[PDB]
Each structure stands twice: as C-alpha cells, then as structure tokens.
Fold this sequence. Notes:
The structure is a homotetramer. Chain A is α/β, with parallel strands linked by helices. Chain A has 15 helices and 18 strands. Chain A folds into 2 domains: 1-57 and 431-478, Roll (Urease, subunit C, domain 1); 58-430, TIM Barrel (Alpha-Beta Barrel), CATH 3.20.20.140. Chains in contact: A-B, A-D, B-C, C-D. Bound molecules: chloride ion (4 copies) and magnesium ion (5 copies). Chain B: Keywords: Cell projection, Cytoplasm.
Amino acid sequence: SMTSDRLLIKGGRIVNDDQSFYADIYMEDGLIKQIGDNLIVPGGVKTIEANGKMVIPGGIDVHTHYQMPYKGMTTVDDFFQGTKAALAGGTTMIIDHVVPEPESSLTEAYEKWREWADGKSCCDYALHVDITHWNDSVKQEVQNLIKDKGVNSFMVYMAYKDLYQVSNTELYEIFTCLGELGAIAQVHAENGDIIAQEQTRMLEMGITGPEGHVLSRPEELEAEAVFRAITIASQTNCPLYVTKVMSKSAADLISQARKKGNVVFGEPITASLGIDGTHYWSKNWAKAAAFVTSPPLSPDPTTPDYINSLLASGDLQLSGSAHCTFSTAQKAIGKDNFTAIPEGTNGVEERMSVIWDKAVATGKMDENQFVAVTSTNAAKIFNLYPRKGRISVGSDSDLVIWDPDAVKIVSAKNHQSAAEYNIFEGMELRGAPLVVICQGKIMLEDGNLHVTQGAGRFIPCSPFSDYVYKRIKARRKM
Amino acid sequence: SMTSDRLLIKGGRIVNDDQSFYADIYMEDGLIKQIGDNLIVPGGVKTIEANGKMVIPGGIDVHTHYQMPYKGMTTVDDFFQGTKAALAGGTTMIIDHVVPEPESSLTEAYEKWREWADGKSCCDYALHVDITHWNDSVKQEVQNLIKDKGVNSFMVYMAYKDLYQVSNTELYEIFTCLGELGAIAQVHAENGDIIAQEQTRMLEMGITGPEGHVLSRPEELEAEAVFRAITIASQTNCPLYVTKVMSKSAADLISQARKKGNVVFGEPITASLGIDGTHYWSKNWAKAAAFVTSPPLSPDPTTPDYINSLLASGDLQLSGSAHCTFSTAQKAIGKDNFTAIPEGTNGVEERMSVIWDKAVATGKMDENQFVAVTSTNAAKIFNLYPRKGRISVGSDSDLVIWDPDAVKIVSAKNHQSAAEYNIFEGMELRGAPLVVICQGKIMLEDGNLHVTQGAGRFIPCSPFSDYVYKRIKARRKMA
Amino acid sequence: MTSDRLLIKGGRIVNDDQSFYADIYMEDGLIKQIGDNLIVPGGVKTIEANGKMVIPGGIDVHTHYQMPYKGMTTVDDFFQGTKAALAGGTTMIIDHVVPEPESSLTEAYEKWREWADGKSCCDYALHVDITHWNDSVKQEVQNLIKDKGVNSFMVYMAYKDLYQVSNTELYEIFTCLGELGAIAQVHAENGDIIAQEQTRMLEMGITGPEGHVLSRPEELEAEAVFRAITIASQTNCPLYVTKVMSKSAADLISQARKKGNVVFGEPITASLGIDGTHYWSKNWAKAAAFVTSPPLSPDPTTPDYINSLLASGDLQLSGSAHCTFSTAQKAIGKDNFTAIPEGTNGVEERMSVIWDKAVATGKMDENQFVAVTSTNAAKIFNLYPRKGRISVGSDSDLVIWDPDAVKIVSAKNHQSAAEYNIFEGMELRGAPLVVICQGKIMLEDGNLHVTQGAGRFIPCSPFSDYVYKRIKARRKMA
Amino acid sequence: MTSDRLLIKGGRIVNDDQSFYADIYMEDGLIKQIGDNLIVPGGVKTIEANGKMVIPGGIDVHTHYQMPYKGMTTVDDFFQGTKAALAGGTTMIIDHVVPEPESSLTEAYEKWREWADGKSCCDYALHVDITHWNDSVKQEVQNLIKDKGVNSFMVYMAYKDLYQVSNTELYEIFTCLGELGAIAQVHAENGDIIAQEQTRMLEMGITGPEGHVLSRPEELEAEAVFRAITIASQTNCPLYVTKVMSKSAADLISQARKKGNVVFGEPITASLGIDGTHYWSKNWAKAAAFVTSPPLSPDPTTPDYINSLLASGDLQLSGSAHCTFSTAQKAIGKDNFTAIPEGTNGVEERMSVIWDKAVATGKMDENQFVAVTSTNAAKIFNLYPRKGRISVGSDSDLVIWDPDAVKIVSAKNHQSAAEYNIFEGMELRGAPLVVICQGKIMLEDGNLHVTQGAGRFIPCSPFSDYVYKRIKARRKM
Lengths: 478, 479, 478, 477
Ligand SMILES: [Cl-]
Ligand SMILES: [Cl-]
Ligand SMILES: [Cl-]
Ligand SMILES: [Cl-]
Ligand SMILES: [Mg+2]
Ligand SMILES: [Mg+2]
Ligand SMILES: [Mg+2]
Ligand SMILES: [Mg+2]
Ligand SMILES: [Mg+2]
C-alpha cells in the first residue's frame, strides 16, 4: 500500500466475524502491523484511546452506482461525494457497476469507469461489469477482463426487455462461460416480459403515479426470475448472486436453494433492510418518486423485519446499498408517467447503522455476524479475504471504532448525498461509527470527514475464490 | 342419449365421491332412471347381481393420444383399439389432444380429429385443442371452437423450442384470452430452451442411449416451467392446468400455489403414479426406449409413492394416462440418438388399478376419493358434472362394478394395446373392474369386451365451469 | 315428526358439489321433492326465493351453552343461544359436555341432554369432554358410543392440575377412541408452559388482558398440536384440533394432511373474523371480552390466512366456540387476567364472517362455503347427507341466503345476552333472509319464530366413512 | 531432552475461514510460528507435509468411554477409546458424566475426572447429564459451572422412570442454565410414547432388534425436538440437540434457526454414515450392534440428507456418541430388544465418513469440513481459538490429512475392543496420515505413539460469545 503515518489504537474491543477480543492495534503504511498487548512501538506514535468501544473491519458496500449514466443524465453522487457518504457511515470499500451501452465495448466502459473512480474515489474500490448484451466478442471481453483487469463479477439482466434483457439460451451460455472462468454470475432478477405488459395495463387504467411502479412489479415477478436464474445456474454448475433482494418470496427461494446445496448468494440492500414500500402511495409525489427503484420496496410491511432475519440466519450473506441517487428535478421527468421516473435511491451512508439497529439491537444477530454481513462475507465471495473484512496482521488498515450505544436521526439535512430526499428520513437508528480509518488514515473523527479526492485505489479481484468455487470444482470432478 | 335396453343392477355398494350406500340401479336409453330399493320395474328386464361389490362411476381419462400423428408416423393404438383398452381398465370416457401442425388451422385439425374419433371410439369422448402456434387468426379460431364446437380446454407448450414453444409474452396473451373466454389453460411445462442445450451437451459426451433422454430433462426444468406458468396464470387471473405431472418438485409447486389461493390443477398420469425412471438405464435398449416420454419418469424412486400421496391429499386432483404408444420398430428409429426416440408410453388400461393399488390399498385415500380422482374431479373441472362422474338419477349410465379384492398381473401378452411393451410389465395390482357399463350397454363382462366401433359420442364441453371459474369471476370484481 | 307442508320456489340451490335452479317441496321434517313444476297439494304455503341462494343450514360444531363455570353459568343458555344460531343461519349445534374431574361422563351427558332437550330451538348433538382418565372412564366412553349417540370426545393438553392429561394418557385415549370409531378432539395448548408464563407475566405486573394473550403465545398452541398429531399418528387415531387460532397451528395441520395423516382443523368465528390487537384496548371491559383460549393472535395477518386455508381445504369446517359471559362475570378478573373467564361470542356471526372474509374476497366459491359451514361437519360427524345437503330424503334445514345483503354487527342487535360483541361495528357482506329448521320457518323478515325445546338430539354413529375408511385400511396392512 | 519442538514444512494449512501454504513451528504444546523460511533452532525434528492438508485436530463432542451400564461398562475405556479417536484424526473428546438418579452430580464429575485424567491419551472435557432435578442438583449445577470448568448439561426426554424430566422441569432447568451461561443439551425422544410402543411390540412377539427401531420411529424424535425447541425459546435458553438421527428432526432444527432461535444440531458418525436397514439383518449380533437411541433411520435417503444439512450449516458439528459394548453384553437382549444395551462405535470413523460423504461428493468444501469437525465445536463450547484453529498461540493439535487416501473400515483393524463395526466393509475417501496432539506425534506411518493419562482436562467457561451474545441482547429488550 501507500504511505501513512504510524498509528496505534489502544483499549479496543476487536470484533472480527469469528470472535471478539481485547488487544491493541499498531498500523503503518496502509497495513496492520501488530495486534496484542504491551506492543513495542516507536516513541511519539499517534495514539487513539478506544476506551472499550468496538473496533471492526470497515464496511464493504458491494453494490454502488456512482455518477452512473442514465438516459442522458448522471446520478448526483459521484465517486468523490458518494464515497464521502460511504465513509461517513463506516464503509471503507465500494464495488460499483460498470454499465456499457448495448452494442458497446465492455472493456472501454471498464476503462472509463476506472478513470472516473481512480481520480475521485476517497476509498478503495473494485468493479462489477454488467453484461448488457451478449455475442462472441463480448465473451472474448469477459475473458480478458477476468485475466488482465481484476474483474471477477459480472451481472446479467432478466428485466428491461428490449434494452438489456437476455434470453434463457443466453443465460445458459453466460453462466456456462462465467463458471468455467471462475467468475461470480450476478443477476438483476425480475421478469421483464411480464413487467412490460403490467406497465401497459397500469397506464391504461390511468395509474400514472409512482404507485404504478410497485404495482407493475409485484414480488411474484422477482421470485419467478430468481427461481429461473437459480435453475439455470444449477444446470450449468455456475455460482449465482442475486442482487437487490427486496421481497420475502425471493429470499425464500435463495434460502431453499442453499439448503439443497446450490451455490447461491443473496444481496439485500439498505432499502429492503430498512423500510417498506407503503410510501409509493405518498400524497407528496416527489417523496414517492424518491423510493422508485427496481425491484421495488415491498408494500408488505412485514418485509424488512424478515429480510433482517434471513441475513441474521445466513440465508442472506451480505449487504449492499445499490446507491443510485437522482435529483428532485431528474425524478420529475416521470411526473405523469411512472415508467419515465429514473430508478434508484440512497443507502450507502445508512447501511451499517440500519443493520445494527434492525438486526443487532433487536437480538437477531450478534456483533460478529454483523461484521460478516457488512464486510467479511463480501470479502470471501469476491476474493478479498483477508486483506479486507478482517483485523489481523498483514491485512489492510481499514477499520472503524463503532459505538453500539450511539443514536442518530437520519435526515437529508445531514447526509453527505447531493439528493434532496432521503428514504430513511426521520428514522432513529441505534449504532454509529465514531472513528473511521481507511488506508491507515483517520478519515472520520468527531463528526468530521478528512478525505483526499482520488486517494482510493482500485483493488483487483481474482477469479476462483475458494469460498465460492471449491464446491463447484468438486461437483465438476464427478 | 341413444337407445339401450333396460338394465337393472341389484345388490351393489354405490360409491360416489361424496358417500357410499346400498341401492339398486335401473337404467334405460343411456340414462340412470332410478336408484333405490325394491324398485318397481317392468317384467323381463336384464338383471345383474352385484353381490356387495362396488359400483362406481366410469373412469374419465382426461389425457390420451390415440392415432396421433408424429413425425410421419402414427401411434399404434387408434381411437378404436385405444378405447377398448380404456374400457378393459374401467375407463368409460377419454379426452384426447388435437395437435395442429404449426401455422395450420386449429379448426381443420379439430374436424380431422372428430372424423377419426366419431368413426372409431367405443366410448364417449371429448377433445383438448393444442395451441401449437399463436397469432390473431389462431385467437379467432380459439374463440370459435369454444362458441361452436364444444371445446373448453387448450394446451400450450413451454417445451419443444422452434417447434411448439411459446414465449412469455405469448403465454400472457394466451392466458389472458383463455381466462376471458372461460377455458381451461393447460400447459406442457418443461423449459425447452435449456433442454435443447442439455440435449446437445449429452450427445457431445457420447450419451446417445435412452438415459440421455431423462438426463437432459432433469425435474428442475419441469419445476421451473411449472413455476413460471403458475406465475403468469396468476397475473392474468387465468386458471392453470399442469398436464403430466411427473416429479415431486413440480407437484410441490402446485401444492404451494393452491394453498396461496391460486386456481391451479395437476394431472399426474399412470406412469408417474405407477413406476419410476430407473429403467432408462436398462441394458435392454428397447425396454428403456419404451419408457421414453416427456417429461420423463423421475429416476428418484421415492417419486411414485409421493405422487400418490398428493393425489390422495387433493394437492393433485385428477388422473390421466397420456396414452401414446409406439411400436418396437418405431421406437428403434432413435437407436443412435435419444432425441429421435418417439415420445410416449402406455397407461390407459392400467390407470384405475394402479391408483387403487398404490393409493387405496396402501391406505392413503379411501374409495370415495378414488372416485374423485378417477372421474368426478375431471367431470367438475371440464364442465361435465354430474352427467359424468356420478351415479345419480338423470346422469349418463357409465358405470363399473369394481372388485377391490381382485389381483391381476399386468403384461403385454394380455393388454388391449398393440404395443409390444408395457412399462408396468410384471406388476401385481390390487383392484380391477368386473363389469363395465357404457351408454347403458354391457361392454365388459366375465373377461370379455363387447364393443361397437364408432358407438362413442363426442361430448361438447361448455366454458366457465363453476368449480374453476366462480373464484376467478369474484376476483375480477375487486381492485 | 310433524311440520306443515312447505314449498320454496325460484331458488338457486347451492350444495357443496354443485349449484342449480329448482323448486323444493318439504313435509314432516323432510325434503320430499326437488325439481320444476312440482305436483303438490293445493293450499301449500309457498315462499318465493327470487333467484336468491338456498343452502343447507349451518352446522356449528362447537358451542358452550349454559356451561358451568366456577358456580356461574355462561349467559347464553340452550334456548337463547340457539336463537342466536338460527338468527345467523345455523340450524344445528354440537355442544361440549363437561364432566367435573373424578365425575361420571355418562351422568354429565344425561344432565346435558335434559338441559338441551328442554331448551334447544334447533337440532343438536354432543361432544363429551374427557376431563380425567381411568378404567371406568374408558368403560363410559364405550357405552356412550354404543348406546348414547356420541362419536366425538375431547381431551385437554391445557389446564394443568384441572383437566390436562399426560402423554401416556393421550396414547391410551387415542388408542381406545380409534378402536371404537370415535373422533379424538383436542384442546391443544401446552398447559405446563402456560402455567409458568402466567406466573412470569403476573410477576412483571402485567395483570391486564394483554397478559392473557402474552402468556399463551402461539408457539404453545403449535407445540401441543404437533404432539397431538404425533401421538394420534402412532395410535392410528383420527385427530380433530378444536379452536384453531394461529397460523403456525394451521400450518402443522396442513403439513400433517399432506403426509396423509387423518387430521382436521376447526377454526372458529373469532380467528376467522378478527385479530388479537384488542387485548391492548384501554377499555378494560372490551379487552376482557376477547379473552378466550387459545387466544386471538396479535399478528394481524392471521385472520386472512385462516380464511385462506379454510378456502384451500387445509382447514375443513367452522365452529364458534360460543361461550359468553356477562360484563360483571368478566370483571372478576380485573386485577388478574387469570381469573377472567374464558370465552367469546360467535354463533350468530359465523356464516356472515366466512362469507364476507372468504367468498366476497374470492378465496372460495359458494359451494366450498357450504362445505365449510355444513357439509364437511356433516361428513366428519357421520351426519351426511341427513344434514349438510339439500336433496330428497334429507332433513329440511335450509337457509335462503342473500349474498348481496350488508349488515353491521352490534351488541344492540344480537340475540346474545352478552353486553359486548367482539365483532362490534364490523360491516359484513352476506346474510340469511329466511331460515327453515325441521321444515318450519324460524326466521323471516327479521323476526324469529321459535319454540323452546323443539330441537331434537341427533345421535351420531361411530366409524364415519370420511374419517375411518383410511384408518381401517391402514389397520389391515402389514 | 526437556522439550518437544517440531516443525512441519510444505503443508497446505486449512482452517475454517481460509486455506494457505505456510510452515508451522511448535514448542511445548503451542503453535509458535506460522509462515515461510522460519528462523528455527538447529536439529529440530522436521516433518515434510508435501502439499498435503494440515487441519486442526478433530473435536468429538460426544463420547461415552467406560460408561456404567447396569453393573457393566462399555468396552472402550478412556485409554483405548482415545487411541481410537487419535487413529481417526480426533485430538479432543467431550464425554458425558452420568450420575445415577438421586446421586450427586459433583461426585459423579469427580469420578469421571479421575478415570479420564489417568487414562485419556488426549485432551478432553465433560458434559454433565442432569439425570434428576431438585434444589440441591440446581446448587450443584451452579458450582460445576463456577468452579469445575463445566458449561454443558444434558437433560433427557426419553427414559421414562429412569431419567426423563417433565415439561415443568425442562422449563426450570432451561431457565437456570440460561441464566448461568451454560449450553442446554437434550436427548430428545418422547419416552412416554416409546415406553408404550415397546410394550406393544413385545406383545405382538417382535423381540428382535427390529423392535428397537420400530418402537422409536423418527416421529417421536421430532416431537421431542420441537417441544424442547419450544421450551428453550420461551426460556431464552440456547438448545443443543444431541445425536440428530432423522431428516424430520434436522428439519425442525433448520426451521427454528431460520426463525432466529439459538439451536444447534449434533449429527453423529452413525446418522452421517449409514442407515437403519440392518436392524432387520438375519445375523442377530449384527443387528444388535446397530442398536442405539435414537435409532438409525430405516429411510435410506437419511444419511445423504444429514450430510447435506451439515454442509449447509443447518447442522453445525459432529460427534460419534461412541458407546461400545461386547458381543456378549449385546446378547443379553437376545430374547428382548429392550434389554439390548444401547450404543455403537463411531469415534475413529467420524472424520473419514464426513470427508467421504460430504467433501468428496461436493456438498461442502475442505474449510467447512474443518468447521464441522472442530471449529464450530470449539466456538460453541468456548474453546476457540485455543482449539479448532491453526494459528500462533493456539494449542498444537493438528492433523496431516490425505484427501486422496482410501481405506476400508473393518473391525479387524479398528482400535475398538468391540467385535463389530457398524461401518464394516465401507470404503472411505479421506484419512489422516499424521496426528499431532500436545505437540507430540501420536500417529505416523500407521503407528500410534501414546502415553496413558497424558491427556489434560480442559475447563470450559460459560457464556461463550457465539452462543450467548444473541441471548443477552434478547434479555435486554
Ligand atoms: Cl423491466
Ligand atoms: Cl423440449
Ligand atoms: Cl392452561
Ligand atoms: Cl426410552
Ligand atoms: Mg486514485
Ligand atoms: Mg360415433
Ligand atoms: Mg326436545
Ligand atoms: Mg374461544
Ligand atoms: Mg491426564
């Protein structure tokens, strides 16, 4: 790593995913150098007294959309403001989605994302590459991005008919390929064919408000796509990763598949963990539009509690935010037609507090599983353990002094995001970060961010991570 | 109905789906005329003494393929020999599938099926019409078949890519249309896109035998299609009917949907009720080929017991056979490539004994639920109750004197089918018919069939049967 | 016995198997002809149904009229309670004989017969509660079945040190009832754990009615149900779960039936109509009026789900457990929820509640409605087709039902002596217009026409086919 | 002359969280360094691992060495039985203290300590069975937790009129154990209904071993499991289901865990390795050798399924319940299955069975194998990371494991004194090559090198985080 001053944290309760213990932590030049008691260190090292508070690995948000092109527009939180929002909330790494235009080069899109992120990201980051269309030369590009460019994760779309949607035949070809090359097959799993029809029906009945968005994507259509993707991934002996798990029925399909032995992961996001979809019916149009995202927040109010429960039980493994913010003015292009409302909400800053408040303080999971679902499982899946997601000697110095007793109200007044709205507005959350260390530097202290634009490094992610692929390889050899 | 002599059955245990009781039955001119004791009857009426044996409504096999065209060939049991096989096994009505070629007229195919069946069927029958392609004029034909030709059931294919398979958009349009017109939407539910790929893979590894057939259609691909069809049918408020339920996973999806309130039916067949798919690996090639059907018999040997269990519990509702037989010589065209083995097995003659043996004698269901899953549920679904599927005054005189203590070994030597092979060969089955009455005539007595070719009548089936559609209509009336 | 001739014309006859238009001619308690242009004597009283539905009269399989309780008696006796039944479209009731422990079952039965024969407005039958067990009770159970028209007996898993029976006793009882051809009913909650949870709730100063529901969480219904299912399966005895209140309990029955177990579930008007949120009402007397065991679930998703399973056949029939107490009797428990007497209303509202919640919402059709209000009860209890069916030879108990009528339920207007109605203010679609019982018009134009004691006891034979054919075939097997 | 230093080179270290290549240096019972080109003293004994796996030693959480039974004793004592453990790659065992009803728990514990301290070849710990319940037992439970290194106590739902406790007692016991930070274990079968079914089976003339399985159908395991789960949930007490034998029982645990309940399941070698069809063997002695409670399921789909749920984490850890009896002791029950003493072998075969049934079949990887053979047991029983992990500072118990070895299991070749092996003739992929325990080489080249009594008792503190942090948070709402 890059240089950073020496730094010693004393009296912390170190909390990894496997255990908790009291020890001091000595850091230098981006790395954790020693862990233990009465450490022999040079004189005059900057020393932080943790005072029994928790020290956890920094959060890894595996799903972001910073400065994402969308129909001429760009999301309002770019790689600089968006990672300030990440760090403010205890997240020290992000993994964004490269989105090439159909009939455009995957690799050129990747180079373009790299230039944006290398110049702006405050913290370390990596990339998924979205497979928005499929043909032989895309397949060649996929191969090269894995071999040469530090990519191990690719997402296909089952939604967005005539834009990104791929057929069952293409899903089989793609999964077959990604499995052979040791990559993670990600999906955006909703049935675009049926959604397309339901949109038309909803518009025809005169339902043009944001409620038309959630009503034309009932969870049954997420569940169907998830099952179909699970089925095809199983036949092609390819590991599957369901992005943005929003409904109970979808999560149950992942739970059921994992019990059978299928290699399948589920990624709930801050939105589905934090809140429900009743606000699509808000008399305040701009508020309702701010919740518009796909798949949508479920209107079933039992949903968020249930998603936290399955994240706690390991039926879901890791969290993201799918942070994809648009301005009030950009949202308003869809005022008389919900299909023109740009899709996306906030959630990068709030992810870790939401999970602590909903799943730890309610007793569903303990602090160690909290570390697993905020960083360590992401690190293992994406072949970043234990460099990330673990406080141990040799690992990167990304870590957070966490206060389980802190209590904050979430507001757009106070968030790092450029967005005028926050879908978690007015929610009181237990659990918050006090101090954030990233690359061995103090980037959050006493409410203040200390960041340098572009300091973030791209972290290449190798294929065939053991946690995912050893089972796959044993199944092949049979 | 047409003329038949008067006929009296005395001392029977009448077994309907709702109750059992002792009464005599008087029949005349195709109809049941009286039911009760010490019936006042004319002199010289032919009288059959039932001697405490069961009298049940005749079986309705809701899935047959008599003399079906298949790639230049024809199945070997035509409408005449095939309904002799039906009657020999206690089935008095069949419902066959009209299969029009893609891009061809549904109505012309229907007329062709009517001519074949009207001239040959020994017993009453009706028709499903397969929607093998979709466009505006097919939709117009569907409309007319329902209005003018006594059709209320249509099947779509999720399998057979580039032959019959329809897209999700087409599934939605079809289910929307069939639901509006009051028809039953049937599905052949397997994922044809993935099967196509898996066939290619299996051939490339050199697996050309019949095991390649089952290995390229694993139950996962039935289940997926079933779930997708269930999902679309729910969104379009259309009742769904899953034909040939073969696996545990598929039947669980139907079970799960019904519990949520979805109007969904499942049709296991004699094959999935009677036996498993281990025989695809038989060293006798011709035997293995004889089991080749789609979806295939599951290799999981726990499957038949479980399918009977869910038919007993009402998670599955009715039985068919999908009787679709080919000769040894016809099967053999697929000797070097499992994909060219013609698809289909026997099962019309054995359906009722198989269910009795596997579900009634093992205690899973009682005799009354046996009547429901062999006739009465079929009658209610297809809008034929109580003319069929019930012994009561005014109903048709199709009925069977059934012996719950009889025990028969199934063999190709003894079956009515023209096929050289029987997939239930050597199986001992408890429960068998003794006497069969159809149109008020004795068509099976003391082991002998008494049939007239072409005596069968086409039974028109009206749309909007209450059992299926009252719930649908009530749902149409809400937000 | 005698009733005037009576003809109903222009009705839509609705049985559980089909619906059709025909006229109905009745005489001397029996249906005599069904069809069109019926040849009948001159001057027969004629009712024009005008296309409205004619259904078999309701069979409420669970009542507690004038039930002894701690010196007191429920306020609806066999006369007032069956007026309430008939007002709501129910023409038959089946009440529970409750002998004191250590007391004769048969003497209690004779006492119940005298009360009911002298007061019941309509036909009725009896369950006998097995409140203790020993060899002479077993002899009595045998006599009641052979000689006294009883085929249904209930054991208690709740009420420790009062009625609760041990696992050993359950096995003996289920073995015996199964050999003699009877229905084994259960009040299935774990009384041992409830006893402890009561103590705990009192010790946290929770004396209000919320303590009642909070000390009987559904987990304790579910446990008992599973244990009763298990023992009944080992002893090859059919099981009948009374008062199914929770989702978890109904799922255990659903699951058992799918495995082929002979098991029935009896939801009641309360669990079908409403939830348990009202145990937290600041109006103490209102909250106390919901106190019954097992309790109404506080999970508001419960009533919709119970209707769903009744629609799907996972539950088969409905009762009310009508067991009413006065405001003054309820108030005994004002400082201790354990002294609040247990029971609510529901006999009058059962059929409207099910129509409104399950038929008008599209979950079941009218024919399944007849099944769950009369025909399945008749088959289980060996009363088909004398009851639960409009056909020649059956008893003339029937109702002209208006699927379009709309009524608000109030204590002002109910037949019950109780000051409170748990369904107060609820608007219900579906209501009876005319009620015929024993061939006599007992409800017409909002007015009841009853004769005290006109009801007959209906003996119920053992071994009903619907229940026992499967059991017998299993007995015969190796 | 005074020390055991030991270096293992060229191993593939396999922990439950990750795998990597490094050398391992050990001294005086501890792992001292892990890495490459380690600076080490001259003349240190060096073992070349040659790319083979190095895993933490197995922890068998369920044994019954030299257990009393009706005046008799199981034939594998603490010495021979831990030789069998080590031979199969297990370096720690946790046995059950069984006090007689109406007898002191603490006196039974002292007796178990004397037996085991004098004989065990390897480290060990103890569960204490609560075979009866009253105020002074409760006092003893408290003292064993505070002063005697016990954190795990088992109750019985079976054995009516011998050990069985009532629902009220279950509630009291779970309430107490939860407050004191202990693991509540259960032997979960309905003893009331089993007692009846035994009598019925004898009265039909079914006296052979088939009567044993037929009188304990899995329905009765499942019922007891659900009841125990239910009571433990109400009392906010963590529950541990010993000897998970059936699919239905394991589903109940799976279902509870998904709801958030703190519940663990312990399949054993028997339910992981084989089924119950052999209760019908015409060879009586063979059938009797399978007699254990709960019994092996006759449903042959069972062992595959148990492995599947152990792979998915629906079950967490493995034991053997090693409880062996001689042919002669088994034969007491020749005319009555109820007199057949209950127990089978399994300590030696546990790790190879799991590797063969779950790793070689692709259900789980090698790292989850480590979790279900040692690391999850260590975390549950408050022994992580001293046990169940190859890391600096942890105990030097570890195994060089050969994923490619293939062995046939036979009684000819096992360490056990028993004449019968329920896994007789089974071919198993996966075997240990070398076993290190307390830093000493106790297995090399097919030979055991053990010293009787070298084992140490390992005190197990209450409130292990993995189990109790969720419980405490719930207490606090
Ligand atoms: Cl879309
Ligand atoms: Cl196909
Ligand atoms: Cl109680
Ligand atoms: Cl026992
Ligand atoms: Mg940079
Ligand atoms: Mg004809
Ligand atoms: Mg009277
Ligand atoms: Mg009640
Ligand atoms: Mg020692």
